[PDB]
Amino acid sequence: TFGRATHVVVRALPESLAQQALRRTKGDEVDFARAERQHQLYVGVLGSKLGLQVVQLPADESLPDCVFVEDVAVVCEETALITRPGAPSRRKEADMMKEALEKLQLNIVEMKDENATLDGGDVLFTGREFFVGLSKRTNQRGAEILADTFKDYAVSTVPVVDALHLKSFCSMAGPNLIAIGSSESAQKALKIMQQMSDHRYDKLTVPDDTAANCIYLNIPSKGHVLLHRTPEEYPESAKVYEKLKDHMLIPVSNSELEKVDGLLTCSSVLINK
Ligand SMILES: NC(=O)NCCC[C@H](N)C(=O)O
């Protein structure tokens, strides 16, 4: 079942994130205490409200981006790909992720090739196939290693030109539903993804590209659940999500981590055991 999960890996925010995490925009400073509250609530939704078993990794102050666990592993069925992140300052985040995923009894494949890089944020898994963004973080060799790892799924690539990652402007919002931004760049990427597949996806188009990043889960006794950005943060995109009477909708605040380019998917790795 697409979107089913039983377990989630998350990682605590280091104090060094506020000043030292990588960020493309040098805008408003991070309110660290508020970022911590937003992470607490996020983890609480996944564990307490939705009932997932949470594995919470400790912060490492030497790894200011270590909260962004998505980028260090891609999990599909019983297999985990431990990535070689594109940013050198993030590579040692793989160490504790590999240990956590071993302890969850997944089959582990490590991206060792020193000519390969891949961030998990560049990977869109639809349930039927993978789309991998080629970005400043993820190269062709990384995409090839992903394809080799998940041999039972088609893997196609798409250029990421004007954002950090593919999932900076898209995500799955349901079993056949791709949430997508409205910018020229997001729409160009969507059209390439659609041209590379023989499967017809539905789309949930939102006016704020980064509000297209959402988390879909299929949870027993709750059904089709969608975590999406709040009306306070993106009022015009929240109006689109709010029309989805076919989902259980959970607004989740993320203002502070978006200052360092993290959206909703970035702070968890979901696992179905
Ligand atoms: N999947 C994601 O949303 N990753 C966000 C990573 C943000 C972090 N500051 C970075 O630059 O890698």
Q: Which two tokens stand for residue 102?
A: 């071993």
Give residue 111's region: left, alpha or beta (phi > 0; psi -120 to 50): beta
| Sign of torsion over alpha carbons 241, 245, 247, 252 | positive
Amino acid type, 201: Y
Q: How many CB atoms lie within 10 A of CB 72?
A: 31
Active-site annotation, residues: 165, 266
Pocket of ligand 1 from Cβ distances under 6 Å? 21-23, 65, 68, 70-71, 87, 121, 165, 167, 260-263, 265-266
Give the separation between CA 171 and CA 132, rounded to whole angstroms.
12
Show the tokens assigned to 1: 């079942």
Nearest Cα to 32, choosing from 12, 48, 57, 54? 12
In angstroms, the CA 62 to CA 94 distance is: 13
Residue closest by Cα to atom 2 of ligand 1: 266
Is 162 marked as a binding-site residue?
Answer: no
Q: Which two tokens stand for residue 198?
A: 């023989």
Task: Annotate the chain with DSSP letters as a single string.
Answer: -TTB-SEEEEEPPPTTHHHHS--S---SPP-HHHHHHHHHHHHHIIIIIT-PEEEEEPP-TT-TTTT-GGGGEEEETTEEEE---SSGGGTTHHHHHHHHHHHTT-EEEE---TT----GGGEEE-SSEEEEEESSS--HHHHHHHHHHSTTSEEEEEE--SSSSGGGSEEEEETTEEEEE-SHHHHHHHHHHHHH-SS--EEEEESSGGGG--EEEEETTTEEEEEE--TTT-HHHHHHHHT-TTSEEEE---HHHHTTT--SGGG-EEE--
For 1-273, CATH gives 3.75.10.10
- Is 266 within any annotated ligand binding site? yes
Would you say 263 and 168 are in contact if contact means Cβ atoms under 8 Å apart? yes
Phi, psi (rounded to 5 degrees) for 63:
-130, 75
CA distance 255 to 234: 10
Length of the chain, in residues: 273
